[PDB]
Symmetry: C2
Subunit: 392 residues, 2 copies
């Protein structure tokens, strides 16, 4: 069959671009595939398969539609006359795409691959799952099935998770310039400083732990870009002052904040250099910044939310259940509800993993578990198996 995939361009170094570099060349040997690549930063990584540069074509026609190029998708499908059109992004973006090709010449058969991260997304977006043209839906996890079914979806739903592979680098500690901290156990959170990822709880818990164990050789690593909503050292300073502990400043310095944007391998070096990988976010479609440490044999503390909860655990990970629920509607146009973990639960989780006997045991568990997990070849073969069932 002739397939059209509407998603991130192969040049994009994002979460979406990561999977598009992997999934497309694997379906190329199964079906004739042509791509509608968006937000293109440079040239096409693939040498053979046809890919449309939607950002440059938008620049040529004289538009600034953020790089998505909705207005030209109508003309694009009419020429390429596909058997199946796949859409891969968050609720909002699909909503604009289906609105754009409402007057599209070819009678195609639409498949959705939604980026869902929170339950109870806004009502003005559920119409995409009931769309009389969408014949198939792809979810990132088992947890989203019930939701997608609640949003009024009468068509077959297929689970399409992700696989990940980080470079295993020996002597990583020294190479990222952490040589001075050889004695300390290092906790890592690679998540970006946004509300969803709740680094305020991370940094909050770090301060509680440090205050009750002021002499533990430990460091807490995290990232943050210029003047984002949470000032992480400021949050930690205030909780250390409230705790009554002496040497607030030296204790505060135990939280190490990276501000520069790293290369793909500095990220890999960072993963190898550390001892515990942490994610305490309120919403997860999948949670790449955790699975990436599981292959290296690092023990894991995760919030039991969304995709992370389904993907993990034969009791191989430290899972913290959300203690409360709030509305996320003020965050963005997607909205919904998310689960917040208790900070003190994160403190319990930390003291658990300052014991090296524990890090060794669970780090061995996660690696042996993620061994069984489906690779990109297993996943992409499941993608086409779902496509064949919708034609005959």
């Amino acid at each position: 069959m002739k397939l059209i995939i509407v998603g991130a361009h192969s040049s994009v170094p994002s979460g979406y671009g990561r999977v598009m570099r992997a999934i497309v060349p694997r379906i190329s040997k199964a079906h004739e595939v042509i791509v509608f690549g968006i937000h293109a930063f440079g040239r096409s990584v693939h040498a053979n398969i046809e890919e449309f540069d939607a950002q440059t074509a938008e620049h040529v026609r004289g538009l600034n539609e953020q790089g998505f190029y909705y207005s030209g998708l109508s003309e694009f499908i009419d020429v390429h006359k596909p058997d199946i059109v796949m859409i891969y992004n968050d609720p909002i973006v699909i909503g604009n795409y289906l609105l754009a090709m409402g007057k599209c010449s070819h009678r195609t058969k639409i498949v959705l691959y939604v980026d869902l991260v929170s339950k109870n997304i806004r009502e003005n977006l559920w119409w995409i799952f009931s769309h009389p043209k969408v014949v198939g839906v792809m979810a990132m996890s088992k947890c989203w099935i019930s939701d997608i079914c609640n949003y009024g979806c009468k068509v077959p739903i297929n689970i399409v998770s992700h696989f990940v592979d980080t470079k295993t680098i020996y002597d990583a500690r020294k190479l990222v310039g952490l040589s001075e901290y050889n004695d300390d156990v290092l906790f890592l959170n690679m998540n970006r400083n946004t509300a969803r990822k709740r680094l305020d709880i991370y940094v909050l818990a770090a301060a509680r732990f440090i205050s009750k164990y002021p002499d533990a050789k430990v460091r807490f690593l995290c990232n943050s870009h210029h003047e984002s909503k949470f000032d992480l050292h400021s949050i930690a300073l205030r909780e250390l002052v409230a705790s009554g502990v002496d040497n607030v400043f030296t204790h505060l310095n135990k939280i190490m904040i990276n501000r520069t944007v790293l290369t793909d391998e500095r990220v890999d070096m960072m993963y190898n250099a550390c001892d515990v990988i942490v994610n305490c976010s309120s919403g997860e479609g999948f949670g790449l910044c955790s699975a990436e440490g599981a292959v290296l044999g690092k023990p894991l503390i995760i919030s039991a939310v969304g995709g992370a909860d389904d993907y993990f655990s034969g009791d191989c990970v430290y899972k913290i259940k959300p203690s409360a629920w709030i509305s996320v509607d003020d965050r963005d146009g997607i909205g919904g509800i998310e689960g917040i973990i208790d900070v003190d639960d994160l403190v319990e989780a930390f003291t658990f993993f300052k014991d090296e006997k524990n890090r060794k045991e669970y780090g061995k568990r996660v690696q042996d578990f993620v061994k069984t997990k489906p690779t990109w070849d297993d996943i992409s073969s499941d993608i086409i198996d779902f496509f064949n069932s919708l034609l005959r």
Copy 2:
């Protein structure tokens, strides 16, 4: 003594407006008090005490200092030459007035009436507690004393709480327009639809309670302005669909939003009308609203936060403890951390008070307990004692 209070003008229908209307006339008989009244809505409510209309004077000088009239305070103090100056606001506003009188000619003693609302307010505001002109600090509740100390306060700290004066009104639900709901038990949340107040939780717990008991004669009431940030019916609607319960739109109608602003009479009428008073906010300095329903012998469900926790005995009231803690830095320039109750805990509370024998019992309990509290005259006298102590 000559005393100047920088605070809300008589006409202001806010939290600060209410306590200013009560405190000023009572200090007037002991001392000469003149008011730098800010944010005026019109005529001064007091016939004889001197109240300065700071907002209109601001307009006369063609300034827009949001009715605070920072530019005017310095000159106002130099003229009146008061013995003491009381600044009654939050830390940012106090900060700004302190800089305003930075180049003041009159040597004067400053007393701060701080409205705190969360632990861990930003450190760049802490300076106001150890400002050299600051001679004393007044706080609203016992819980805030240890925070102000942690912030580095070396001056006397006094507790100045609040009293509540709501009239008892006969035939109340007929008068507010709720005569169609005689059999229904009415839960009342009088709080403003802001983030702090967590009406997203209230509404969400209402939805979960309704889906649990579809035929329970119950109504939930709350408030919201033109275009706030939580669309309450939206949150409610989405949760009902999730539970799978039928007759969604009728069940949704049980949650009643009041968009219309209310006069002092109608607020009092609402309290009289309803069967259970609810406050599920993540931050309270003292926590008016709930205390307003307690003098009428109405049962209260409250979040055990800030001043609400100090003020009510756990035996006379249904207290819910926070389950999770989050940063608030994104909300305001003040910031801090606040505690959030579990939505399922609020459900337990709602089902506890659907039985009338519990409402009768806990109603009698609060009325008897709040009876033993200090009145406004007890509070005003304590205020004037504190000032005398600081003078000689």
